[PDB]
Design an enzyme around this catalytic site. Structure first.
Site, PDB file in Angstrom:
ATOM      1  N   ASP A  35       0.821  -1.195   0.000  1.00  0.00           N
ATOM      2  CA  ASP A  35       0.000   0.000   0.000  1.00  0.00           C
ATOM      3  C   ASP A  35       0.859   1.251   0.000  1.00  0.00           C
ATOM      4  OD1 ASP A  35      -1.930   1.889   0.266  1.00  0.00           O
ATOM      5  OD2 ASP A  35      -2.481   1.409   2.348  1.00  0.00           O
ATOM      6  N   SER A 199      -0.620  15.756 -11.906  1.00  0.00           N
ATOM      7  CA  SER A 199      -0.867  15.387 -13.286  1.00  0.00           C
ATOM      8  C   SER A 199      -1.102  16.647 -14.100  1.00  0.00           C
ATOM      9  CB  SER A 199      -2.075  14.467 -13.377  1.00  0.00           C
ATOM     10  OG  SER A 199      -2.459  14.274 -14.723  1.00  0.00           O
TER      11      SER A 199
END
Length: 330
Positions: A35, A199
């Site tokens: 994770d 992004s």
């Protein structure tokens, strides 16, 4: 040193991925959920409330000659999906794909919430976010990666998740045969303890690319792609009959649909998520309403590049003094 381990979807939807981990002496192998959005290595154990164990493989510290109670240390964690676990702590030897760390904090669960109990395939979590998020008190503990780092050939790990197929977690090297083209690296902020990056924009299907900054986290422990409501609405508007359902808890679409791809930007590079990756199947057995793999992050408080996005790429988690993230097509 290096390590290399295969990671395998737990079910037919790629809801999560498990990776075998060797704990203790002699080795006890548990299948852990790696994770990158958390920083605790915790396991089902001989200390876990019996009624909260249902099929998991447990770690038994008393059977490990290298286990030592970390006296006074406790831990307690809550995840974004509302699940939780807590317990005490041992140190022991932990190996992943041939890479060994001695003195790793292994957090033994005394209690786990229902969602963990109900998932017989996951024996615990191995956190790979920054150690500043580790929940051990009163002495915070380091992640497996943080502990391994100085011994690694290069201070990196890579996530290469498969679509309905096994993939690979590598530690300490970049497998140049595992991706196509070049890797594009992008800046990381560690201010929230995550692999947090920005992004450069998105496209829906064959549509034009929208240049827009989207701050989010690279999180292998989250199944879906969670983005701003504007972006998500633009995606689902291209699917006939798609709608957000409060009763179901997100966007659903007719199972008869063909989903468009979704592209996200990494600097000037582009990662394409095929439409099939965005299909999470009937909302309930036999339903003709299917659950979408791109959902709104509104009210999560953060955008999450979960498995839906990450599995479309070869992803480098660069843990050098100035951390960065790299993405390549594959």
């Amino acid at each position: 040193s290096t390590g290399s381990a295969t990671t395998t979807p737990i079910d037919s939807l790629d809801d999560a991925y498990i990776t075998p981990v060797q704990i203790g002496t002699p080795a006890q192998t548990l299948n852990l959920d790696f994770d990158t959005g958390s920083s605790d290595l915790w396991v089902f154990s001989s200390e876990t409330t019996a009624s909260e164990v249902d099929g998991q493989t447990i770690y038994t510290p008393s059977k490990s000659t290298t286990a030592k109670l970390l006296s006074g240390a406790t831990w307690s964690i809550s995840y974004g999906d509302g699940s939780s676990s807590s317990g005490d702590v041992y140190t022991d030897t932990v190996s992943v794909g041939g890479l060994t760390v001695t003195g790793q904090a292994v957090e033994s669960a005394k209690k786990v919430s229902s969602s963990f109990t109900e998932d017989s395939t996951i024996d615990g979590l191995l956190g790979l976010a920054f150690s500043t998020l580790n929940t051990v008190s009163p002495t915070q503990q380091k992640t497996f990666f943080d502990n391994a780092k100085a011994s690694l050939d290069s201070p990196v790990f890579t996530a290469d998740l498969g679509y309905h197929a096994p993939g690979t977690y590598n530690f300490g090297f970049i497998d140049t045969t595992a991706y196509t083209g070049s890797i594009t690296y992008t800046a990381v902020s560690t201010k929230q303890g995550f692999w947090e990056w920005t992004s450069t924009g998105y496209a829906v299907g064959s549509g034009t690319f929208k240049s827009t900054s989207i701050d989010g986290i690279a999180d292998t422990g989250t199944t879906l792609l969670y983005l701003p409501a504007t972006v998500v609405s633009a995606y689902w508007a291209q699917v006939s009959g798609a709608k957000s359902s409060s009763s179901v808890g997100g966007y659903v679409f007719p199972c008869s649909a063909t989903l468009p791809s979704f592209t996200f930007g990494v600097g000037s590079a582009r990662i394409v998520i095929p439409g099939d990756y965005i299909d999470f199947g009937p909302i309930s057995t036999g339903s003709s309403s299917c659950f979408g793999g791109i959902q709104s992050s509104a009210g999560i408080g953060i955008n999450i590049f979960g498995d839906v996005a990450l599995k479309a790429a070869f992803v480098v988690f660069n843990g050098a003094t100035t951390p960065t993230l790299g993405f390549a097509s594959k």
